[PDB]
Design a protein around this nucleic acid. Structure first.
Lengths: 123, 67, 54, 465, 46
RNA sequence: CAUCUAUAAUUUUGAAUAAAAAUUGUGCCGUUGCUAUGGC
């Protein structure tokens, strides 16, 4: 009857595009890794969009994030594996939530804006 | 830890002048444009011919150096 | 110090394409991305070695 | 005493042996056998035991090791040198002794004897690196301490049986002798990100293709102890590499999803991309289920000098031929999809129906990775493994446009880091031996959701006919 | 020193317990006890 | 790597303690027995 708590969840093609921009941002130092760093970037206001894993045990520990996202008008996605998120994030350990921050002199600007456009139409 | 490396390319036999004609690409990292006599020696022991018979000329080092 | 692929490119007006945009890195002959340090660094090491040897 | 008479006498003894075995099989043939023994070198596959195998009664075995997370294993096997009939091995006491060399994240390199197909791998010798090998100066010009001090990540044993090379996250290649495991030479990669991620000796030769994670493929020469050439071209890290007799290597770089074949003398790199479309796949099935996008590309193996197989991490095992750019065949999720999270674990809630409706059903399933892959050289059979607890053995159809699944082997329990094949016995009926290093976690990271019932082991499986 | 580090660990874990306890609809002492046993095993580690 | 010394099995006195000639599965814990293994 209701939605699942994870929703909106991403299709596989959008997931590939998301993880590509995640890896290039982690290469160019734009990516904050972890739920605490993501919440801190949401408070400081520096984030561009949020990726969240939709299978961590349990789901509420990062489900605290969409409330801040809705109150500050940030888009967020839910990808289906924290294992793949940690791998494409470049950590030796699964990450459940990541925050792509904003920058203006960034080499990946239109890549971030393309995927963020896809997310904003996903919502 | 250096190694000159010779790679012949486009070997064309020519029995009219009784020879073979090709292009020689040399790789020489951390080294400055290996001598023509040493290249004659190495090419001779590669093709099993004589140092007094093998001939090389017309070299050009790439910009940045190392080929 | 900077090489696009393998070529040590020293022009600041180069107009990179996409493949170059991903391939830009420090040149392998530089003291930043490779072999022995510069003349200032090894001269400082030499003079410190001398001042310890005397 | 002259080399002419010596080589003539050795060749005549070889001919006597071949003729005698021709007698024992008759209880044309010699020309065909000699044509085979030369025709190993050039071109396509010829070993055709794709149906001869009996995987049913293939006797399995597991051995446990006292060190955690075996990373890689490379096996040495002496083969009679056909041009001059001496041997592959270096000594006289070796007499055709097969060896295995494993390297583990506990900074340990171990050499086992495996020449007896009945008994178990016998740990001959071992060597351990510690924190007493940390380089003093951080200049990175000299990284030349004689031991490993960070996470040995792969190994390769030389086909002349003289050396073994170990590479790891300490951005070095340390080459040790094989008999005492004493480090004869150490070569830094000379880079702040040049971690060695895979190794491959050129088959039956001395060259060495070390693929490192500053997006580069370095090429060394061992018996001279030098570096010949650095090949550039990958966008993401070059993760895996395979090599054969010719001077062509093949590398797979992961998130750019590319397999590049490097012809080294012609100095030319061919590229291969995949690019499946789940929309076209779903409508191609509606023309009559779960379809996964190409997440990455992990493992490669070159089956002959014109085809090679590539295993991704979204289950695809693809077969590529040098003619067509697109994959000539693609086997789907073959190692199966992964288990489902438990509803109490996913909820932390009381209402069981709500736990299920947040388990979401179909939209949360993921496929098993392909952790390791290996083809027997110039054959039509290859082995694929992951943490699904079973090796899968596959046979390429002799038109070399598709392959099918021969069988399973369920001795596996854990992440199959590396698969290797050693053959022995006579040319008539060759005994094969699959040796797989199996661990609890991946090669590179941890990343893995606590595989249950998994040990640090070496899994042997002897197959006949 | 170790008291400060263990209090920081306890702060992390009580924050996570607060997350699950609020955003579930009817919470669960099984994950409460999971987190408590984890902190106690870390204390035994120290 | 070859050679040699000793350990491991044989030639001979020999029941042999004994004196003599030469050669070529685990880091810790737990289960199962006429080797298989569960947890960290």
């Amino acid at each position: 009857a209701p939605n699942p708590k994870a929703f909106p969840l991403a299709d596989a093609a959008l997931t590939q595009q998301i993880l590509d921009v995640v890896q290039q941002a982690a290469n160019l130092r734009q990516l904050k890794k972890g739920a605490n760093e993501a919440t801190k970037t949401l408070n400081r206001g520096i984030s561009e969009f949020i990726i969240m894993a939709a299978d961590c045990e349990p789901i509420e520990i990062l489900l605290h994030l969409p409330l801040l996202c809705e109150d500050k008008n940030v888009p967020y996605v839910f990808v289906p594996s924290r294992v793949a998120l940690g791998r494409a994030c470049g950590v030796s350990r699964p990450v459940i939530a990541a925050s792509i921050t904003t920058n203006d002199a960034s080499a990946i600007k239109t890549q971030i804006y393309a995927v963020k456009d896809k997310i904003e139409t996903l919502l | 830890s250096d190694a000159v490396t010779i790679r012949t390319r486009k070997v064309i036999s020519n029995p009219l002048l009784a020879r073979k004609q090709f292009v020689v690409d040399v790789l020489h990292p951390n080294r400055a444009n290996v001598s023509k006599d040493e290249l004659r020696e190495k090419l001779a022991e590669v093709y099993k011919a004589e140092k007094d018979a093998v001939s090389v000329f017309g070299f050009r080092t790439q910009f940045g150096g190392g080929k | 110090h900077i090489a696009v692929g393998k070529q040590i490119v020293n022009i600041p007006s180069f107009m990179v394409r996409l493949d170059s945009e991903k391939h830009i890195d420090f040149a392998p002959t530089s003291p930043f991305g490779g072999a022995r340090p510069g003349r200032v660094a090894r001269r400082n090491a030499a003079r410190k070695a001398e001042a310890s040897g005397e | 005493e002259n080399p002419a008479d010596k080589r003539r006498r050795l060749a005549k003894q070889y001919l006597e042996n071949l003729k005698s075995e021709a007698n024992d099989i008759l209880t044309d043939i010699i020309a065909s056998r000699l044509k085979e023994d030369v025709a190993e070198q050039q071109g396509r596959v010829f070993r055709y035991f794709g149906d001869k195998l009996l995987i049913s009664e293939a006797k399995q075995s597991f051995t446990r090791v006292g060190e955690n997370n075996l990373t890689c294993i490379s096996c040495f096997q002496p083969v009679l040198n056909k041009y001059t009939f001496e041997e592959s091995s270096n000594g006289d006491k070796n007499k055709g002794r097969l060896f295995a060399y494993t390297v583990s994240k506990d900074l340990q390199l171990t050499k086992y004897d495996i020449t007896d197909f009945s008994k178990r791998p016998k740990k001959l010798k071992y060597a351990k690196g510690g924190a007493k090998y940390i380089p003093t100066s951080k200049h990175e010009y000299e990284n030349t301490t004689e031991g490993h001090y960070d996470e040995i990540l792969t190994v390769a044993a030389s086909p002349d049986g003289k050396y073994v090379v170990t590479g790891g996250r300490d951005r070095k290649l340390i080459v040790w002798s094989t008999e005492s495991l004493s480090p004869v030479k150490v070569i830094p990669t000379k880079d702040r990100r040049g971690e060695v991620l895979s190794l491959a000796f050129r088959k039956n030769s001395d060259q060495l293709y070390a693929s490192c994670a500053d997006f580069k493929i370095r090429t060394y020469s061992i018996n001279q102890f030098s570096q010949l050439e650095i090949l550039y071209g990958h966008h993401d890290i070059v993760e895996d590499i395979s090599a054969l007799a010719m001077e062509r290597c093949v590398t797979v770089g992961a998130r750019d999803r590319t397999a590049m074949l490097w012809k080294i003398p012609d100095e030319t790199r061919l590229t291969f991309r995949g690019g499946d479309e789940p929309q076209k796949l779903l409508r191609r099935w509606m023309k009559e289920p779960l379809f996964f996008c190409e997440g990455s590309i992990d493992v490669v193996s070159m089956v002959d000098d014109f085809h090679f197989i590539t295993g991704s991490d979204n289950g695809n095992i693809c077969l590529w031929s040098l003619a067509k750019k697109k994959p000539i065949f693609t086997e789907r999720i073959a190692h199966g999809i992964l288990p489902e999270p438990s509803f109490n674990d996913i909820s932390g809630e009381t209402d069981e129906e709500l736990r299920k409706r947040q388990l979401q059903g179909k939209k949360l399933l993921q496929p098993f990775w392909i952790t390791s892959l290996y083809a027997i050289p110039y054959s039509n059979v290859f082995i694929s493994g992951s943490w699904s607890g079973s090796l899968k053995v596959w046979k390429i159809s002799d038109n070399l446009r598709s392959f099918e699944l021969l069988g399973e082997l369920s001795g596996a329990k854990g992440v199959v880091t590396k698969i290797q094949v050693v053959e022995s016995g006579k040319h008539g009926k060759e005994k094969f031996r699959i040796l797989a290093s199996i661990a609890k976690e991946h090669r590179l990271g941890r990343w893995i959701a606590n595989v249950s019932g998994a040990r640090n082991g070496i899994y042997s499986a002897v197959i006949d006919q | 020193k170790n008291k400060g580090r263990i209090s920081r660990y306890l702060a992390n874990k009580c924050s996570m317990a607060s997350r699950i306890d609020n955003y579930s609809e009817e919470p669960s002492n099984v994950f409460g006890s999971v987190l408590k046993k984890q902190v106690e095993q870390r204390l035994e580690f120290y």
